[PDB]
């Protein structure tokens, strides 16, 4: 078996205590770490998957196990692609992590249960978000199908079909698969091979890195001096890294808390890399890699720096405080249990603007008809245009309004 790492990212969406983690487990082999010291930093889940060919009726394709025995052929599998999974929870309070996950993702999998409530706005909202964030590769999957009646499922499918056609996602495949009884995943695997292609990626463009998770390597058992460096789980979109480069977290931090601040952002060199199971040399983008840099084990532990941009020495981007946004509004609101109508923008009110992955608070000053000027409270960086989703407040918690683009 060759040690070729991740190439393309696939994600999973749903609801709490429904069936996403179970699905992930079914897909993979080794159990995940996520769900204070271990794993606890962000609500996002990271898991891997295998694409192995064995082609030497119509539906049979490949087996997840390293050695296939169930169909018949005892031959050795062809290496085509290795993939990394990002698990994102659809809880009503926390969605920043989900948003962050979306930015790195290039394939989306929808999972809704069968033996519960049918019309849910959250799923629709998720779909809308997917449509917005540069995606056409949408696969619909049904979770709990085994505890369902003979025609009810069919009816549900029909209803779904009726619902979904007038969207950005054109020819979306719909597959019903069980996660608790372990069946029918072959079809899914086949689909994964068929529908999803690989976009071009080269060494030319300057590196862009996003760190979601943070880890510390301190476990009880050994004596006093048995220490390892701080590991930062960072996923790459474009820009290849080799061992021997300086990694920096962009926004910066306060040095004394009186006294003026002028200290540059935190620089760190790579000590030990963690990919799939163990160590590797080259970092091919399109996967979440636990990069172990010279950042403190005391710093990376809790909710302090979740979802921030990472650059390299040599190339310099720009940091902004006043942001410029062009907005597009929707007809009626998404993600509300009954539906409510969208009001026009009002001056002097706290609203949350999500640019790419960051969750930041913004205040409205001057809006004519298309352009919007906003004031930031927590630091944020700007590169090109980014995938922007707006969130406004009416009652209790956050609600989506529409999509946005930066004009410069």
């Amino acid at each position: 078996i060759i040690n070729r790492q991740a190439t393309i990212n696939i994600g999973t969406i749903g609801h709490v205590a429904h069936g996403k983690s179970t699905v992930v487990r079914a897909i993979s082999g080794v159990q995940t770490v996520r769900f204070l010291e271990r794993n606890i930093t962000i609500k996002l889940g990271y898991a891997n998957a295998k694409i192995y060919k064995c082609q030497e009726s119509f539906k049979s394709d490949k087996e997840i196990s390293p050695k296939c025995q169930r169909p018949g052929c005892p031959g050795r599998y062809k290496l085509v692609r290795h993939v990394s999974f990002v698990d994102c929870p659809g809880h009503d309070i926390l969605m920043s992590t989900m948003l962050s996950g979306a930015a790195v993702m290039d394939a989306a999998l929808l999972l809704i249960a069968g033996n519960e409530s049918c019309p849910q706005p959250q799923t629709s909202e998720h779909l809308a978000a997917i449509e917005i964030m540069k995606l056409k590769h949408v696969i619909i999957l049904q979770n709990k199908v085994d505890l369902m009646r003979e025609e009810s499922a069919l009816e549900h499918q029909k209803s779904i079909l009726k619902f979904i056609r007038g969207t950005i996602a054109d020819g979306a495949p719909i597959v019903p698969i069980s996660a608790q009884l372990k069946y029918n995943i072959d079809a899914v695997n086949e689909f994964i091979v068929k529908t999803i292609p690989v976009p071009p990626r080269d060494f030319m463009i300057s590196p862009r890195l996003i760190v979601i998770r943070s880890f510390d390597v301190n476990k009880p058992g050994a004596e006093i001096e048995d220490l390892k460096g701080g590991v930062a789980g960072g996923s790459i979109l474009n820009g290849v890294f080799k061992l021997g480069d300086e990694i920096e977290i962009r926004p910066g931090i306060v040095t004394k808390d009186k006294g003026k601040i002028q200290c540059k952002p935190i620089f760190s060199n790579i000590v030990s890399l963690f990919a799939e199971q163990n160590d590797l040399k080259f970092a091919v983008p399109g996967g979440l890699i636990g990069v172990g840099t010279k950042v403190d084990p005391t710093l990376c532990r809790a909710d302090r720096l979740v979802g921030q941009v990472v650059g390299a020495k040599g190339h310099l981007p720009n940091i902004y405080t006043d942001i410029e946004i062009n907005y597009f509004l929707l007809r009626r609101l998404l993600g509300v249990k009954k539906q409510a109508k969208v009001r026009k923008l009002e001056p002097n009110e706290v609203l949350m603007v999500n640019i790419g992955s960051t969750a930041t608070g913004a205040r409205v000053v001057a809006v004519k008809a298309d352009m919007a000027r906003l004031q930031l409270t927590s630091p944020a960086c700007t590169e090109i245009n980014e995938k922007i989703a707006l969130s406004r407040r009416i009652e209790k918690h956050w609600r989506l309004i529409g999509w946005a683009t930066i004009k410069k």
């Binding site: 539906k59 495949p173 019903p176």
Partner: peptide, 17 residues
């Protein structure tokens, strides 16, 4: 598009305890 699904459904129906 509504073609490769029915077969899968049939297969699912077939393979049960």
């Amino acid at each position: 598009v509504g073609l490769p699904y029915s077969e899968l459904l049939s297969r699912f129906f077939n393979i049960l305890r």
